């Protein structure tokens, strides 16, 4: 499901001026990195299964999704 | 009114297993509550065994009231029921 779409054509207590306004975002690539650990300080470093086992952590990788928001307006992101 | 006269008593003349068990339990509890003992106590100290000796010698002072299904009852002293 690669697209979301908002819309409003007209009649919002204006002076009869109508514009078609689509707001839209495009999902891009997925980026998969090695499992990392973030401390309450905010410092980061590599995470290994034994550390996740000892400190009752979850052994997981961050998933990033590129989003490129576009708009088209016809009168009638990291 | 609901009691039955000693002549028309039509139940068994024999002490049943349940009557014997409950009578022995009750007598044992009684003797264990520092009740007087009717038999001659020679060797035994367990209240249940004393109760068994009293039951065999027909010297347990209790009465079984045997209820009939219609609510009436018959009364039998333990000493007049026959123990096997």
């Amino acid at each position: 499901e690669p697209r979301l779409i908002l819309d409003q054509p007209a009649q919002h207590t204006n002076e009869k001026d109508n514009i078609n306004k689509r707001y839209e975002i495009r999902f891009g690539k997925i980026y998969l990195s090695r499992p990392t650990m973030t401390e309450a300080d905010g410092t980061t470093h590599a995470m290994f299964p034994q550390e996740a086992r000892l400190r009752n952590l979850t052994y997981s990788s961050p998933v990033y999704l590129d989003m490129e928001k576009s708009m088209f307006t016809s009168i009638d992101g990291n | 009114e609901l009691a039955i006269l000693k002549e028309e008593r039509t139940t068994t003349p024999y002490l049943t297993k349940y009557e014997r068990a409950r009578i022995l339990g009750t007598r044992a509890l009684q003797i264990s509550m520092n009740a007087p003992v009717l038999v001659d106590i020679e060797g035994e100290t367990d209240p249940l065994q004393i109760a068994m000796k009293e039951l065999s010698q027909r010297k347990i002072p209790l009465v079984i009231r045997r209820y009939l299904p219609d609510g009436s009852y018959e009364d039998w002293g333990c000493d007049e029921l026959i123990v096997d």
Partner: protein
Amino acid sequence: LIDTAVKTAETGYIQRRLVKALEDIMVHYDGTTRNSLGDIIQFLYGED
């Protein structure tokens, strides 16, 4: 193994229902076999 595992539930249900059906039945001092309502099931237990 499946038979042993599966029939035991039906058997336990059957035995529970039989016990509940027959739980209130006792031989009385007049020899009759009556339930809790006093109704006669057999006039003499086992007929002997």
